[PDB]
Amino acid sequence: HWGYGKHNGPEHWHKDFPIAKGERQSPVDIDTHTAKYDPSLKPLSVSYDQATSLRILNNGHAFNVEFDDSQDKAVLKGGPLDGTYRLIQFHFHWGSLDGQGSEHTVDKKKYAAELHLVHWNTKYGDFGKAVQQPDGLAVLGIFLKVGSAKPGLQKVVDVLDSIKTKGKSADFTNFDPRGLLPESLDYWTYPGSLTTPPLLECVTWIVLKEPISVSSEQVLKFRKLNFNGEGEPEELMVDNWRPAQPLKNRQIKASFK
Ligand SMILES: COc1ccc2c(CC(=O)Nc3ccc(S(N)(=O)=O)cc3)cc(=O)oc2c1
Numbered sequence: 001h002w003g004y005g006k007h008n009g010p011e012h013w014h015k016d017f018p019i020a021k022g023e024r025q026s027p028v029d030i031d032t033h034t035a036k037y038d039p040s041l042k043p044l045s046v047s048y049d050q051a052t053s054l055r056i057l058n059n060g061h062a063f064n065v066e067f068d069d070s071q072d073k074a075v076l077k078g079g080p081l082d083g084t085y086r087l088i089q090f091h092f093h094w095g096s097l098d099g100q101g102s103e104h105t106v107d108k109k110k111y112a113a114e115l116h117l118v119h120w121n122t123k124y125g126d127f128g129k130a131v132q133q134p135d136g137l138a139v140l141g142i143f144l145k146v147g148s149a150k151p152g153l154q155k156v157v158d159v160l161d162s163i164k165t166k167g168k169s170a171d172f173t174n175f176d177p178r179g180l181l182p183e184s185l186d187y188w189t190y191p192g193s194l195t196t197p198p199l200l201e202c203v204t205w206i207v208l209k210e211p212i213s214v215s216s217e218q219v220l221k222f223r224k225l226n227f228n229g230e231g232e233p234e235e236l237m238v239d240n241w242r243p244a245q246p247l248k249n250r251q252i253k254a255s256f257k
């Protein structure tokens, strides 16, 4: 089965998932000098006031904080987007060291980790239908750099001991994702894909220019997690990031000068 190790990591994925070598794969390096300002881009509209989190799950590749997406409660609109995209879950990708861990890079710079808030286009009715559509998803990507702690992340880091191994889940209600956002909503946008198998090309990527700062102790607790199930040999969950993919025939647009 796919993973992030020597024998099953991102160089191997194309054998099970040939779209790995497709025309709109993610992540990508964001070349800040080549991204064009697009003044017709609208401001991003993040409406998380009514977000309802339910649960947090170690799925063996990362941990997801899932939300109740059966009504329009936490939506992303505007920016490059047409219509309404509903929050379904967020997760992170992170490194074994502070020097690496993000999927997207900026002028080849790697951040310590990267947050992905995953939303689906409500005109497709459900997340499973949306992933099959070229404009099915909108993922908001936020870089994390190590410095001062992010207080709004701490509730997430503290529950990690209860989901150490693959398949473990834990109630996680009343978590407010607004506490994970940076001050600015300036962003780059391009068309891409899920960054893990099945690597479907269904994502409008929106990656915020401003990273959030998290403490070394916060990111250290991410690295205590396990890719394996309980009672299997311990492999730390670290370096669960796919490296930058060829941009090919795509332009990255900036929302800002
Ligand atoms: C029927 O419902 C579902 C629920 C989950 C998935 C999933 C699981 C999933 O959601 N993957 C996923 C989500 C987000 C990402 S990323 N790293 O690009 O933000 C990378 C991978 C994939 C899929 O094809 O069909 C599904 C259908």
Ligand SMILES: [Zn+2]
Binding pocket: 091, 092, 093, 116, 195
């Ligand atoms: Zn992700």
